[PDB]
Structure formats: structure tokens, C-alpha cells
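Components:
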Amino acid sequence: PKLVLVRHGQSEWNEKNLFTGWVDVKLSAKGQQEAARAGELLKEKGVNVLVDYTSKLSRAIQTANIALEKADRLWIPVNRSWRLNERHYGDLQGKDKAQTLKKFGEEKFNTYRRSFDVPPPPIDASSPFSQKGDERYKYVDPNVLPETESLALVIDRLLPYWQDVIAKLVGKTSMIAAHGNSLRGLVKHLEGISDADIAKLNIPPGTILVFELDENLKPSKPSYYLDPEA
Amino acid sequence: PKLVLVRHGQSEWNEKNLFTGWVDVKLSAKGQQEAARAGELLKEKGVNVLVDYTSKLSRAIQTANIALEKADRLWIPVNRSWRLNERHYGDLQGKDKAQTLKKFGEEKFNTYRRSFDVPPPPIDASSPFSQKGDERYKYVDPNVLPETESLALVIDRLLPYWQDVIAKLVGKTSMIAAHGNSLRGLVKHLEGISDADIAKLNIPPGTILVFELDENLKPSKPSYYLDPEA
Amino acid sequence: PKLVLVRHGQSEWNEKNLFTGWVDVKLSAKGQQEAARAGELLKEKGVNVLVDYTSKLSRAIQTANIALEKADRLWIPVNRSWRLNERHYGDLQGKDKAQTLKKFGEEKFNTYRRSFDVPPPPIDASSPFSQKGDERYKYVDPNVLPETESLALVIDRLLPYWQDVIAKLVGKTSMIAAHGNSLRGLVKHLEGISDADIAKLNIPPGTILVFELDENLKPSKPSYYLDPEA
Amino acid sequence: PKLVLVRHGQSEWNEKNLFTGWVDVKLSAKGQQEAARAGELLKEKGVNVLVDYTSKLSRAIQTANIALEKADRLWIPVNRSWRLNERHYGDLQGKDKAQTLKKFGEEKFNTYRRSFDVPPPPIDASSPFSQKGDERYKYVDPNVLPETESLALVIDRLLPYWQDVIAKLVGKTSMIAAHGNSLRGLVKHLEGISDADIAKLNIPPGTILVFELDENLKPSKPSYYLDPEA
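Structure:
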């Protein structure tokens, strides 16, 4: 029926000047714009959107919330969870995607997150660049919120809720924004790729995408990016 | 604990050039601004906001969604219903709050909505300025969506869900934006006034307000408008 | 589609030896039996049952829970509310439907609950035969739980949730047991009768009934009692 | 706070005369009894029970539903999922825990389900002793419902929902019946054992048990079986 796969913008942290994280720190102008653009895209092009889901974060939300205002809806239930986020970086943060790179350089910078057995180093509870129990988060076995996090285990964050909650209604129209890897995650498991695949398709923020599927959610009709030339 | 009573902005229909309605048609710039302002208000001043509710409409939402982005949250469950809207006008629409006034003038213009036994004339299903079953709406006994609507019966829209759903969690922090009359409605029943009262306190959009209450939701600590001088 | 209208059994309080109430005190053997019978009825006859609702009470539940076990289901979501109960008696209780009758006798005994402007006398919080905040109940504006209660206002208990929650899914199969008056209530508003009507059709517990309806929930196909000769 | 860990009865299939399965086929008399007993146990002994969960199955439910009626509640929300069942047998069924045993005998009979890399053989969709999409089940990525199933992967059925949904409220009292392995599953991951452990503690149906925990759900106060001598 409908899979609306949207990758936010570029936040305003890491991006711009290298850093960012699972941290949750809004996003610049491109967001609103690109997002509004995407919002512009689903509607204007065609289709509308029945149900929406967000990795309990402001960043992504901005993207999602905006699209809706312009298409001409805004009105609808919405569902917020913690199974839809950017792969927790490791023990880095700030960095600048330079000194880090400058330091170790190599596949290390590239590989770290990527495949497995080596996500970014963990993360202690004595670095403002973590993410623990900001209210919210503590309505979940505290024995959860990760530590390093990869798009692998990430598969699970995606997996349970996917079949469970959304997979439930999807007998209709629903949209789960997320971005960076989640969406990769959604498709990655979804399509073919193969754990070694994906690793090579960041995915265009702003714009928006649909899978189509049917009953047993295997993608019949391919994938449309509204702006294939985006 | 917390009652966050927020009256949107001024849409961009009626307002500006007289008209508007239960119709659902976004809002101008003041909205984003005033709203962002309010959003600015809850947070900046103090407090934060646990749970949010909207009369399944884009207008109000804009106001609500914005405040959240600036305070610095955006992240949280949110609940959308159809028991939180602007008192359906009657059989007017467009008007211009002039010819209508110009035409009948008198308490008629003033009184129509106001008290009772005379809401605006009903409304047929052959005027683009109605509101029937835009998707959504038809997940409700169709034998519902009003026709004229006053802030009286409106009391009920407010009443059932109020005690039922929100009244449920309010053992914590929650915010239900709405505006125009709903909020009047929330307080009107809530405080003293007396059906003949309220009728004289439109309430400042943008800004935001808290009741305080306790257990049996009777307003102990009075009401704060963040900007008493707003 | 489906309205399954079931009136419990006869509890084991009032019934048997005159008394009973909104109190919530299980039910005798006929319940299990009659209920199982009804349970027997929906299934055996035909149909099955998608969704179930109960006036947060053990009495009715017994009836509902049983039917399900025998038809051969038991498995399914279920929804419990406080908008589905027996019209709170007044200030009587125990009584015995004799001394009370013996005392005032007249339409008083008969009329009390019945129509209006005279439900049973209220009820204070110093008679074990009330019902206040047994856990549960206090997840509702405390400024609720009635006091006397009639099948009139009762209409409202029925009304909000009816259109709101169930009325939502009923685009499928759902069953809301209740009994005594609720069901009267469900039909009473539903059909014709006329406030002065109903008052003359207690309705067979045990057995079970279906309305049929369609879209705008007006009863197309009449009403089947599985056992018309019950 | 409260973990109520209850292992049904003994159904009435496999048990009695060897067979049974993930199939879902009620239970004999001991159930009602033992269950009622357990129901008897939580209440009578002490405590009460705030929230209840069932592996969308009649068998277990019978057990759960009964306890409640006798303790003296029955009234409360209840939550039904498909993440709480008996480890799907494999490709056997009926059997009789004799010919099967008689046939292969050995750890094969004993080991099959047990640890891993050898659950019971799968199961095709041409044996009435499977379990596919009995209504219900098809509100889940169809690409789910297992095939063989072990108490290992089973860990996951337990895992997602556990932290997600219940783990949510457990800041209070809740009970998730299930049985056979689920409960093993609940504790198995929960305590120490070690994949090779559990394998040696079937757990007493009927009766009921509590863990206690706290915040980060690690079992402070040990485990009480109401009837240690049961």
C-alpha cells in the first residue's frame, strides 16, 4: 500500500561542521526547506498520508511535521516510539570528521559503524554526548537504551515494532520518517542488499519515498523518490 | 498539576479579512510567531510539557507543533481527537463580519453563537464551507459531526474526553491547544463564569496558560498567562 | 455489521433475594450457564466475535468471558471502560424489593428509576452500598462517578464512548455485554421507543443479540435473539 | 513491584494422552481448578493485580480469567498479544510422547526443543496441526508467525514487548500468564540460568508467582510461589 520513507535533512550539528549524534539536536534550514519540499512532494505529486511514526526525537520530527503542514493535512493520530533513530555513534562525538579521521583515519573512520563487530566505541555516562533517560526514555526497561549502536541490532529496533504496531494498520497509509540508517534499515532488511550492501546509499533527506507492497509486505511495485533526479 | 491552555493565533481566513470557520484552513504568520512565542513561553519561563491533544485540525496544530520545537522538545506521544475544535459557525461563512453585520447587525451578529437556542443557522451539504467526512471524521458515528455548533454542546465535546482520556494521565503534565472557544470551554465549565459569563474573554492566542489543579481537578493555584501583560 | 447485545444473568444479590446494585457483586449459577448458553449461541448458531467491552465490573464480565470460552475463542483484544454499567440504584440497597415496596409501594417502587426527575435518592459516602474509587475509578475525573443514576444520563455514558471508541472499529465485529439498562440504553436511543418506551422490555440475560446496521449505524436488518423463544 | 508469573494448567490435549501444541486447544478441569486456586492464591494470600497479558490463546486465558474471578476482581483493562505462547512444537503433533519417543527416542525426544540448532522439525501448511492466520494472526507481518519455535528466539517474542509495552507500566502491578516456556523464558533471561540452565524447571501451573524487582527490573526480593510446597 504505502511506505513513506523519509530521511530528515542534515540536522545542524555534525553535518555543517562535523560531529552530531543519536543525541537529538534539531536541524538547520535545509531541513524545514527540504522537508517542506518532501511534504510538498507526497501531496503535490499525488497521494496523502494516513499514519505517522518518529524515533522520539525533535530533529526528524521537524522534517516530518513540516511536510504535513504544506501538503495540507497536519491533522491525524501520529505515533512516537524509540524504535526509529540514528545509529548511536560510539565514543566519539564532536570530532569534526577530521581529527578523528585525521587521528585513526582508514576504514576505521569509514568502517566503524558500517557492518559489525566494531560499532563506534561504547559510551559512558560522563560525556554530555550520550543519551540515557531524558524523561521519556525511562518508560522502557532502563536495561535498554543502547550504547554504541549499529544498523544491525538496529534491525531489531526496526523489526519488532515494524511487524507489531505499524505492520498492523499498513493495510492502509502510514509514514515513519526517521533517517540516516533507520530508513536504510527499513529497506536494507526489506529489499535485497545483504548486510554488505546498503553500505553505499545514504539516501536523499528532504524528498520522500514509497515502497507499495501488499499483504505480506514484499515490495511489488518498485520504489519512487518523487524526485528521481534529487 | 498542569493545564496548558493555548489559543492558536488568528488562522488567516476570517481574521485578516472576516470569514473563517470550523472548516480548518491553516493560519498566517502571527501563528508561527505567537505560537513559537508561546512555545518559547512554557519552556523559557519554566516548565516543560508531557502530553499534547488537538481538535484534528491543521490550524491549531501549527500553533501547538511550533511551541514545542522552540522550547526544545518536539519528542513525545501526542493525541489527536475531534473533541477540541472551534465552534462550528452556522450557515454563514465568508461573510466578512460586515455585510452579515451590515445585513442583520444587532445582537444577531454578536449573539448568534454566544449563549443558546440560536447558534448560527445550521449548514447543508451543498456549501464548500461545511465539514463532513474528510477521511478522518468517518471513524466516528457519522451521525455526529454537528451542524451549527455552540460552545454549550461544545461543553460535551470537552466533557467526555476530558474526564475520560486526558483526565486519565493529568496525574502528570499534558497540553491540549485548541482555541477560540474550546479553551473558553475548558475554563468556562472549569471555573465559575456561568454560561452568561465567559461571553467576554476571547483569550490571547500565541501565549500559553496553566491551571495547576490537583487530584479532583479543581483549580487550586490560580491561572498564569506567562505574559500577564500580553 | 454487528452489534452483540448481551444482558448478563441475574448476579446473585438483588435477584435471588431482592437488593443488588451498581455495586458489583458477581452472579449465581444461571450466569455461567445462561452466559455459556449465549456464548454457545453466537458461535454455534453462527457468527463469531471480533472486539469486546465491559462496564469495569466482574458481574457482567463473568457472563461475557464465559460465552467466549465455549463458542471457542477466548483469544482477542478486549476493552474495559466505565461507560457501561447498571443504573446506579439510589439510596436504597439491600431493601429486598419488599419492605421498600412494602414501605412506599406505588409507582415509587416501580417509577423510581424509570424515566426522570426522580432517580433513586442519591447516595452518601457512608453506606457500604455505594461505589466510589475502588482503584480503577480514580483514573477518571473524580468529579464523576455518579450518585443516583438513571438510564437517561446513562444515555451519555453510552453516547460518548459509543460514537468515539467502538463506533470506531464497528466497521467490523465487536461485542459490549453490559446489561439491565445499558443494553436497553444501547437499543433505546438506537431504535424508536421514546423515553417513555423501553420502560417495558427488561431483555433476556444469558442469550445474546445482534443489530446488523451499516455505515451510519442505523439498524437495517432487524434484531435476532438467537432464541426468539427465550 | 510485581511480576506475576503463571503457568496455565495442562490443557487437555498433549498432557492427558500425549500430543498438544502451539495449536491452541483449551484445557481440562485441573486448569479451572488449579487456576482458580492460583487466582485464590494471589488475592487470598495477599496482593491484587493491576494489568494482565495473554499469548492470544484460549488455553492460557482460561487459567488467567479464572484466577481473577475468585480473587474478586475480573474488572480491569487487560492486554492481548502474540508475544506470549508455548514454543511451537515442530513437525510432530499428536505423537503421544511414546511412538515419537518409541521411534527416535533419545535426547532427540528430550533435546528437540531444549537448547538450539534443532527445534522440532518445521511445519508445513498441510497439517491441521500448524497455526497460521486464524483471523487475528494476520494483523502482523504475515512474514512472521514462526514455524518450529524454540524458547531461544522465543526470548525475542518475550524481549521486545517486555521492555516496550508492559515494562512501561510495571511501575505498578501487572500480570502476564502464558506458560510452559514463556514463563521459563521470562525468568530464564531474567535470572541467571544460562541457556543450558532452565532446562530443568517446568514450573507449577495453577499456582502463581511474583518477582518484585524495582526501577531497572533486576529481581531484588526473590521469588514467591504462594505454595512453596506446591
